[PDB]
């Protein structure tokens, strides 16, 4: 029975990965990101899609979720998707700088603004990746995010959330939030992930050292062969 | 027809990845490394192996090949292998520092010395990963490497080379060198890889931007679905 994490649990575990075990943020983000694009490509394969190539909106927030998001975009390009990225609040740090520019020399479009009504989103993108807020977030959804979140939960087309449905109280979830169709739990799943309603819940981040796994008695599922994602249930 | 690279070609391409496209060395090394452990796990699966868990020697040199090597070790642990690492000449830089310590808190053994005769190697390890020298190397195999290379080409058990069979003149190859059974070409394959004799030749490093691919007219094979490795022929 794979454990779902308290907010403090996760941040400590995260803590070790950078502290004791010395994974750089570069490293794990790439894999977080790779896991994401993997999950998505599996969930919703291009063959099974309605356009060639299949369009996806990646909506990246200001912290790390954004990061994973950007990686994910780029791998999904590689995987055959035609992503567009909207990245409103960008911190001025080489990491995020780097990932942006990577995406840019992938001929990945960035949008300067969110289209205002969900119907136009639905019309321009087959899948929306929610890269806004992750575990460590603690309410106070400032603009423009409230406004995007607002649009998002109006969509017909499905949303893929990275780690957390943005704006779900990380433990509470949110009865009235956005209800994404795929939730890629990274590292371990989060208490909120029990409120998850949709059709795909992959786990990702094949990097937990078994010592860490036995520490925070995670009972991780065995990933198959060489995969970096596992479907749940 | 996938192009095999001149030494200068590769280093320029590499050059762009860090320059124009701004991939950090952290990033691409992880994927290089992940590709490697992938290739190996596929080539030689634990089920098909003779011990449980299947032992592997990873021999890491002083430059980047070593790096990929160390990553690879750790992913292969994750993949179900029981690797040991011998890492004689270690540069004092946080990158390599980091990867070591990662491996260490994976309960991965490091050897203090190379066992002297290949028969003992054969007896203690089912597969030897050659993480010594890559493309950019330019002869003058200094000790202890000549001595290890010497042991290596005496082995019964198979060798997996990362990017290059260490001590093959990167273009010439080496008729009388080590003759590894799996060669994981990273990014693109190298002129020497035409002299390759053994049974598995995977290509790896799913990160080439198609602009780069069209630039250095690489004609890369399409990786399947979400894989980070392709078997050749
Ligand atoms: N965003 C990440 O890289 C990450 C790292 C560890 C746990 N969860 C997510
Ligand atoms: N060692 C690596 O990360 C690498 C990067 C680019 C090309 N080949 C190998």
Give the ranges where B89-208 is alpha helix by DSSP (H): 94-104, 118-124, 145-152
DSSP state of A91: -
Tokens of A233: 């249930």
Q: For chain A, how far is it from start to end, CA to CA, in angstroms? A: 11
Contacts of B82 (CB under 8 A, 6+ apart): B53, B54, B55, B56
Q: Any idea which residue has 């093959």 for tokens?
A: B168
Q: Is A137 annotated as a binding residue?
A: yes
Cα–Cα distances in Å, from A24 out to A14, B126, B197? 11, 31, 37
SS3 of A81, please?
coil
Q: How many CB atoms lie within 10 A of CB A107?
A: 11
Residue B84, classified by CB atoms within 10 Å of its CB into exposed (0-12), middle (13-18) or buried (19+), is: middle
Return d(Cα A131, Cα A108) in angstroms, integer. Answer: 16
Return d(Cα B141, Cα B158) in angstroms, integer. Answer: 22
Among all ligands shown, which has an atom nearest to the Cα of A135? 1
Are A171 and A191 within 8 A, CB to CB? yes
Contacts of B12 (CB under 8 A, 6+ apart): B216
Return d(Cα A39, Cα A196) in angstroms, integer. Answer: 16
Ramachandran region, residue A178 (left: φ > 0; alpha: ψ -120 to 50; beta: rest): beta
Peptide bond into B210 cis (omega under 30): no
Cα–Cα distances in Å, from B24 out to A30, A95, A98? 11, 9, 8
Tokens of B158: 């198979």
Are A206 and A31 within 8 A, CB to CB? yes
B142-146 long-range contacts, CB within 8 A, separation 24+ = B144/B88, B144/B114, B145/B61, B145/B88
Q: Any idea which residue has 């030897």 for tokens?
A: B128
Return d(Cα B134, Cα B183) in angstroms, integer. Answer: 12
- The values of phi and psi at residue B203, to 5°, are -100, 145
| Domains identified in chain A and CATH numbers | 1-233 (3.40.50.10260)
Are A56 and A84 within 8 A, CB to CB? yes
The greatest distance separating any two alpha carbons of chain A, rounded to the nearest whole angstrom, comes to 48
Which chain A positions have a beta carbon within 8 Å of B105's beta carbon?
A: 20-21, 209, 211
Residue A73: CA count within 13 A, CB half-sphere: 29
From chain B, which residues contact A within 8 Å (Cβ)? 20-24, 26-27, 30-31, 34, 37-38, 41-42, 45, 75, 78-79, 97-98, 101-102, 105-107, 206-207, 209-211, 225-226, 228
Return d(Cα A14, Cα A2) in angstroms, integer. Answer: 17
E strand or H helix that includes residue A228 = none
For A64-76, give the secondary structure using H, E and C: HHHHHHHHHHHHH
Return d(Cα B11, Cα B5) in angstroms, integer. Answer: 9
Give the ranges where A82-192 is alpha helix by DSSP (H): 94-104, 118-124, 145-152
Q: Is B138 annotated as a binding residue?
A: yes
- The values of phi and psi at residue A178, to 5°, are -95, 150
Q: Is A140 annotated as a binding residue?
A: yes
Task: List the A182-186 sheet strands across, edge first.
Answer: A110-111, A82-86, A55-60, A128-131, A159-162, A182-186, A202-204, A229-231
Give the ranges where chain A is alpha helix by DSSP (H): 7-18, 25-43, 64-78, 94-104, 118-124, 145-152, 210-215
Q: For chain B, how far is it from start to end, CA to CA, in angstroms? A: 11
Are B186 and B47 within 8 A, CB to CB? no
Give the ranges where A79-194 is alpha helix by DSSP (H): 94-104, 118-124, 145-152
**DSSP letter string, chain B:** -PPPBPHHHHHHHHHHHHTTS---HHHHHHHHHHHHHHHHHHHS-STTSSSSSPEEEEEE-SSHHHHHHHHHHHHHHHTT-EEEEE--S---SHHHHHHHHHHHTTT--EESS--SSHHHHHHH-S-EEEES--TT--S---TTHHHHHHHHTT-SS-EEEESS-TTSBTTTB-TTS---SEEEEESS-BGGGGG--SSB-EEE-TT--HHHHHHTT--PPPPPTT-SEEE--
Peptide bond into A199 cis (omega under 30): no
| CB contact burial A45-56 (16+ within 10 A = b; e otherwise) | ebeebeeeebbb
Resolution in A: 2.8
Among all ligands shown, which has an atom nearest to the Cα of B69? 2
Tokens of B13: 């391409």
Return d(Cα A42, Cα A49) in angstroms, integer. Answer: 12
The greatest distance separating any two alpha carbons of chain B, rounded to the nearest whole angstrom, comes to 48
Return d(Cα B48, Cα B25) in angstroms, integer. Answer: 34
- The values of phi and psi at residue B85, to 5°, are -115, 130
Return d(Cα A96, Cα A70) in angstroms, integer. Answer: 9
SS3 of B188, please?
coil
**What is the distance of C-alpha A74 from the center of its chain?**
13
* Closest residue by Cα to residue A202 from A24, A15, A28, A36: A36
Q: Is the CB of residue A5 below 6 angstroms from any atom belonging to ligand 1?
A: no
Nearest by CB to residue B27, choosing from A30, A101, A226, is: A30
* Closest residue by Cα to residue B124 from B58, B56, B37: B56
Are B202 and B232 within 8 A, CB to CB? yes
β-bridge pairing A229-231 and B229-231: unpaired
């Amino acid at each position: 029975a794979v454990k779902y994490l308290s907010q403090e649990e996760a941040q400590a575990v995260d803590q070790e990965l950078f502290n004791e075990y010395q994974f750089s943020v570069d490293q794990l983000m790439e894999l977080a990101g790779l896991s994401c694009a993997t999950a998505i490509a599996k969930a919703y394969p291009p063959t099974s899609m309605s356009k060639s190539p299949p369009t996806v909106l990646v909506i990246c927030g200001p912290g790390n979720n954004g990061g994973d998001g950007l990686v994910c975009a780029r791998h999904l390009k590689l995987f055959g998707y035609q992503p567009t990225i909207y990245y409103p609040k960008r911190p001025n740090k080489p990491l995020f700088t780097g990932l942006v520019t990577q995406c840019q020399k992938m001929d990945i479009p960035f949008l300067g603004e969110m289209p205002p009504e969900p119907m136009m989103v639905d019309e321009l993108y087959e899948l929306v990746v929610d890269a806004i807020f992750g575990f460590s977030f603690k309410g106070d959804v400032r603009e423009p995010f409230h406004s995007i979140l607002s649009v998002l939960s109006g969509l017909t087309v499905p949303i893929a959330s990275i780690d957390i449905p943005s704006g779900w109280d990380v433990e509470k979830g949110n009865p009235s939030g956005i209800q994404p169709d795929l939730l890629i739990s990274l590292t371990a799943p989060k208490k909120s992930a029990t409120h998850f309603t949709g059709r795909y819940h992959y786990l990702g981040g094949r990097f937990v050292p078994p010592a860490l796994e036995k520490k925070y008695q995670l009972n991780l599922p065995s990933y198959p062969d060489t995969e970096c994602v596992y479907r749940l249930q």
